């Protein structure tokens, strides 16, 4: 057993059929020692007595809020969370993993240090999240995360729509241009009713980069079946652009889709369409990170 | 007098003819107090006695290793180095200054933070060098230098060729784009026998930059007395090249010389030669730092 916060404890439990439950002592926060009575918010009536209550916690009915009493007045209460362990593996049942079998997915629009991480939930009910820097060493990368919020966007995997959550974070001290020598290690604590689980992830900001689509994609014809297309770097992207260079792929219509797109490092090109869309996306010139969303415009005069 | 390291002390001395030497007390590192005697590695026999030896240090014979003894066994020893001061000036006799009358010359091939400093020596014998960050304040630039090594190259000044030393250094913390707001202040300690001197220098890495010569200098003709010459930035140079841009000068034949060289910011040009060499050197586009070495290459029927 271990303390999560004031008067909230987590109990690790082996979830095999014939497992011996953990015996946990819960003492009352009062100077008195007589006429002490205990109750649970999962059971009817008095379930114990004595200043210290000793119980065997195996099932989830053995969890919850245990309340003290003396002479009809309440005294204190302690909360029990369960951390399931089955076949040697810690449970991961509150969150739904993405197609790539990861649970936490983070992406950053630039190298400033700000980024967001997101996850999916199997059932959006009675949830409590909290995310922070897992490693707390001096040579760790300090991060200041916000509070988790339910997002309007709903990811659809298999034939099910999962609600997604998200949280924005900022790296404390930064030098965008500097090379990253060690990763950002994060940890999400997840609760659902009286179930406790936790998810961890490590990453370099360079690997999670995904620029925003190029802005001001304008049109200008040239001759029969030819048109010059121009654009400019997005406002979100890191500055100066001479250092944080970008490359672009250009495809035609009728992550990184490289089926029939041609590379252009400059911010303009000449191409033939005369019917259909001319779409262009961006990527960091020097590192193979995630590409941007497509920015499309028709091919009409 | 002041301590350089454990049991090694430096004595500042005015080297005018009739100068009063500095009196220095040397105590023994032992709990005993009787039968204590002193010797020197510059003098024969016992030169003193008592737990504390008091001597007048003026000449170099008064320097060296002073050893402590009791009952035939050695106890401890202290080393004395001399720092000469003549006409108010601290001596600079171990090192030979360059043509520009400086002693330390540093150069960097890129903005990484790595660089090297070099110096010359008048006589390569019984030398000990050590270089470090002179200022040790919080707002100073921290540097981690290596060990000084004798170089194969020998600079030739006047009518004599002098042996050269060099040491590579790295600036602890770096930010590629960042502007340098204060310089890198270094200090070299030099010893030769029992003589101590020290040399200092301050610089911004941007000022010591000297790129390496441009690589893959290929040729491709055009017409009678016309030919296109192309090259590419050197591998040592900082990246990305869109930020760390370079300039190039192109001269003809038959450390920026630029006597008859013409500027080209792009990595190629068309020029007339039809006989001779076409040489090209590089420089940082935006700062007037040192230029690179030259990269040279030579130049019927219907
Ligand atoms: C993700 O999820 C995992 C899985 O739960 C988290 O891992 C757990 O973290 C907690 C807190 O960091 C760990 O608890 C600590 O455990 C140590 C060591 O405990 C063992 O050794 C002790 C020796 O004194 C012993 O007392 C312990 O006994 C208890 O537990 C057993 C059952 O295991 C039970 O039978 C006993 O009756 C006891 O109740 C155990 O054998 C312990 O020393 C710590 O306590 C000290 O330090 C704290 C901090 O100051 C202090 O407050 C205490 O008073 C005490 O001085 C503390 O209990 C837990 O062990 C981890 N789980 C595992 C499997 O190792 C992980 O933290 C989560 N990560 C994130 C990022 O959220
Ligand atoms: C390059 O070369 C120059 C030239 O030598 C170096 O300059 C010298 O650096 C050293 C170390 O930083 C300096 O020594 C210190 O001196 C101070 C002040 O000393 C004066 O005032 C003292 C007042 O208490 C007094 O005691 C001193 O007296 C001694 O010297 C006189 C002769 O000058 C002699 O007659 C006496 O008998 C004494 O022996 C002197 O008047 C001193 O306070 C320092 O000591 C304290 O701090 C150290 C550090 O913690 C500590 O260990 C000590 O116990 C003590 O608490 C220390 O001795 C020296 O003064 C500098 N030279 C000059 C001319 O100023 C320079 O450092 C070199 N640079 C590089 C980068 O290598
Ligand atoms: Cl210099």
Curated annotation (Swiss-Prot), chain B:
Gene Ontology MF annotations: cytokine activity; cytokine receptor activity; growth factor activity; identical protein binding; interleukin-12 alpha subunit binding; interleukin-23 receptor binding; protein heterodimerization activity
GO terms of biological process kind: cell migration; cell population proliferation; cell surface receptor signaling pathway; cell surface receptor signaling pathway via JAK-STAT; cellular response to lipopolysaccharide; cellular response to type II interferon; defense response to Gram-negative bacterium; defense response to protozoan
Function (record text): Cytokine that can act as a growth factor for activated T and NK cells, enhance the lytic activity of NK/lymphokine-activated killer cells, and stimulate the production of IFN-gamma by resting PBMC. Associates with IL23A to form the IL-23 interleukin, a heterodimeric cytokine which functions in innate and adaptive immunity. IL-23 may constitute with IL-17 an acute response to infection in peripheral tissues. IL-23 binds to a heterodimeric receptor complex composed of IL12RB1 and IL23R, activates the Jak-Stat signaling cascade, stimulates memory rather than naive T-cells and promotes production of pro-inflammatory cytokines. IL-23 induces autoimmune inflammation and thus may be responsible for autoimmune inflammatory diseases and may be important for tumorigenesis.
Outcome of substituting residue 147 to T: In strain: B10.S/J and SJL/J
Subunit structure: Heterodimer with IL12A; disulfide-linked. The heterodimer is known as interleukin IL-12. Heterodimer with IL23A; disulfide-linked. The heterodimer is known as interleukin IL-23. Also secreted as a monomer. Interacts with NBR1; this interaction promotes IL-12 secretion.
Residues with attached carbohydrate: 25, 100, 110, 198
Disulphide bridges, residue numbers: 28-68
Subcellular location: Secreted
Main location: secreted
Protein name in the entry: Interleukin-12 subunit beta
Gene3D superfamilies: Immunoglobulins
Highest taxon listed in the record's lineage: Eukaryota
Effect after changing residue 262 to L: In strain: B10.S/J and SJL/J
PROSITE patterns linked: HEMATOPO_REC_L_F3 (PS01354), IG_LIKE (PS50835)
